[PDB]
Design a protein around this ligand. Sequence first.
Ligand SMILES: O=C(O)CNC(=O)C(=O)O
Ligand SMILES: O=C(O)CNC(=O)C(=O)O
Ligand SMILES: NCCCCCCN
Ligand SMILES: NCCCCCCN
Ligand SMILES: [Zn+2]
Ligand SMILES: [Zn+2]
Ligand SMILES: [Zn+2]
Ligand SMILES: [Zn+2]
Ligand SMILES: [Zn+2]
Ligand SMILES: [Zn+2]
Ligand SMILES: [Zn+2]
Ligand SMILES: [Zn+2]
Lengths: 384, 384
Amino acid sequence: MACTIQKAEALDGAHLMQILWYDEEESLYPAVWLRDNCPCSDCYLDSAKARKLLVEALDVNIGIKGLIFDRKKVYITWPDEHYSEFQADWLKKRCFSKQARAKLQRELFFPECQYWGSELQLPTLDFEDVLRYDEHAYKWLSTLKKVGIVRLTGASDKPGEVSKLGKRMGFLYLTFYGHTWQVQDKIDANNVAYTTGKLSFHTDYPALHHPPGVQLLHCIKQTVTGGDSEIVDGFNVCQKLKKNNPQAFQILSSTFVDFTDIGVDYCDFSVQSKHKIIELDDKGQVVRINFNNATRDTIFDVPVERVQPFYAALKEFVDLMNSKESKFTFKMNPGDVITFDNWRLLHGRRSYEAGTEISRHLEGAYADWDVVMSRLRILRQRVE
Amino acid sequence: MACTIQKAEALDGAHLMQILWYDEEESLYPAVWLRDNCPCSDCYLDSAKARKLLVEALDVNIGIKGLIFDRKKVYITWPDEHYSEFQADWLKKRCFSKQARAKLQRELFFPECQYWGSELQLPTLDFEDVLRYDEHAYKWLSTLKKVGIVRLTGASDKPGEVSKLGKRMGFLYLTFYGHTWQVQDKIDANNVAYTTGKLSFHTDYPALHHPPGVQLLHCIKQTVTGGDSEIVDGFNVCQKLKKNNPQAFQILSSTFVDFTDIGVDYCDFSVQSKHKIIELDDKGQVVRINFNNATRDTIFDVPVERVQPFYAALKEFVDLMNSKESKFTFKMNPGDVITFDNWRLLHGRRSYEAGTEISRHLEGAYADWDVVMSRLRILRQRVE
Ligand SMILES: O=C(O)CNC(=O)C(=O)O
Ligand SMILES: O=C(O)CNC(=O)C(=O)O
Ligand SMILES: NCCCCCCN
Ligand SMILES: NCCCCCCN
Ligand SMILES: [Zn+2]
Ligand SMILES: [Zn+2]
Ligand SMILES: [Zn+2]
Ligand SMILES: [Zn+2]
Ligand SMILES: [Zn+2]
Ligand SMILES: [Zn+2]
Ligand SMILES: [Zn+2]
Ligand SMILES: [Zn+2]
């Protein structure tokens, strides 16, 4: 009933088509949008699933010249004699009602989000199962999107495991630190990560204007002397901050902070960026956290009177992240891989002891959320 | 005189340091920022040029306990007995005055912009000179940033030339269409680009949330039957649109448009994004154009009443781009490479004739603006 056409007619100076569906619901489609979306071979390249029609070809004041229909299709003539056919199901999916549009957006972008604190049950799957089975790889990526982290257990204790996951996704995101990179204590370290020091909560790579969306970290060697992992749900923390201290939230979501990274690794680099630490979308919703205290520049591009209040806000934010209700701590063992949303979570590590041999070694890499989401869309379709 | 210290003192409850320079100018530095930016080996990892100090270690209400100075350095004791030394030049550069901050930002981000229309003199350099000489590679990247395009002449007529430029920059930006890609007419084309059809003005890859910043296109084979290139300065066009039709500008800078790309190339993909066609920063300035009419989805996530006005605005924008005062047309010959700002310019191509052999072939690739800007910073330093 819902996608079967009972009546189709041109209305409002013929600038709209109305469909009455067999469940008595009505849908409205502007003529200009129909013309723009003609699926004929002149207008639309089927092999590419892409529009050939130019904006220049589109009369924005167009009206429908004629229309006939049956239960499954509408057939339209245009004023310049162009002819179009539209399928009922295709029309129904693209209905302009708020409910229909929102449903479709949920299907495209997987917005469901489960916020968490110290009660987190770390989602865990088997590494080889994820590589082998679409059902498991679907569970991996959909959980990564919804919860912001998944642990994979049973990988090897050798390099090359994150690269396998990269291929399973599609491809990894190359940066100045390489295609993959080795977290271990290094002489003349070019990054605080490559020491035995504590890493407080941070996101990776705010020195880029487009920080990595997803991070992969594979434990190859672990030390008994420290090196525990800690994570927090940045979106959950930002919610608490807005409630508890709206001025601090306002400062952190409005102040551009400069980040920097200069050195040599995969290539020689001199990188500079500006970000708001709490990055909001046009509707006021937090979409990314951009914060690494190590790479925050000494350069701070604000008037003198805004400085101390910024630090005071930052301190409140960090104190909230460190709260026993917010953080989750765990320790990686050799063969574990964590995969997480680097736009949402902040992560850290406990200090550990230096010595003469390497006592601790992670291999890491990055991926782009668009690459990950593409694989997720494909997997859903394959498993359903 | 300007970077020599005449007096340094703690002021305002010791929460500020004031420097009187020998030119009688004064600079103010908040105590909290000084403490945060202590360069000692406890606070700062010199090998990484990065901050070790944690936010947790920072007293946001800190004041200076004691201060002495000479002409070139300040020496500070803190309330908890921590001790810091700051160099005059380092302080002077980071002065919080609006003039000093703006000067420094210009140095980091190369904001100078030369808008253009049909009068454009296409900046042109030799390909091999750019690969060989830093002076020439500096001119290439600084012109690319300022004007939005540079032609390089004298490349080979063989694949692999854009890859050389990629290495000269640092690395290319991998996408689903490959590390590099071949623009030619293809059977069962997965993209309108890979046909002989006309491409109206577009930016590449708005189906990604982070479209490529810089595009490289190398002419390997060119046809006499068409295939001319066209470009327009999107920032210039957006300025004209705001002046001529503020409602159209408001619509295009506020409406989220869905983009899509589904197919198989380097990998199998199903990509979806949303962008505002005219993307403004927090100050109202245009920072990116996101528009490809081929990959604009049939899905359009707006209420029905906003549809026709959107198309009417889009048409006005396109008509402005097509204006004889706005566009610049030229034709690539084998051995030419164009490199351009894909966030600012829109580009297109004239249709040409299909036949049995390949009559036209470009090799293209992408790079990230942060990668390009890093190389530009490095080059400036090397050449100066
Ligand atoms: O070493 C760890 O456990 C965590 N490492 C990082 O967060 C990093 O390198 O950015
Ligand atoms: O073929 C040309 O001249 C231009 N090509 C493109 O703009 C493209 O492939 O996106
Ligand atoms: N079932 C209606 C088919 C209409 C075809 C018209 C072709 N111009
Ligand atoms: N020139 C002044 C040097 C001060 C050194 C103090 C060390 N604690
Ligand atoms: Zn149906
Ligand atoms: Zn058509
Ligand atoms: Zn990290
Ligand atoms: Zn290199
Ligand atoms: Zn000096
Ligand atoms: Zn110190
Ligand atoms: Zn293009
Ligand atoms: Zn693949």
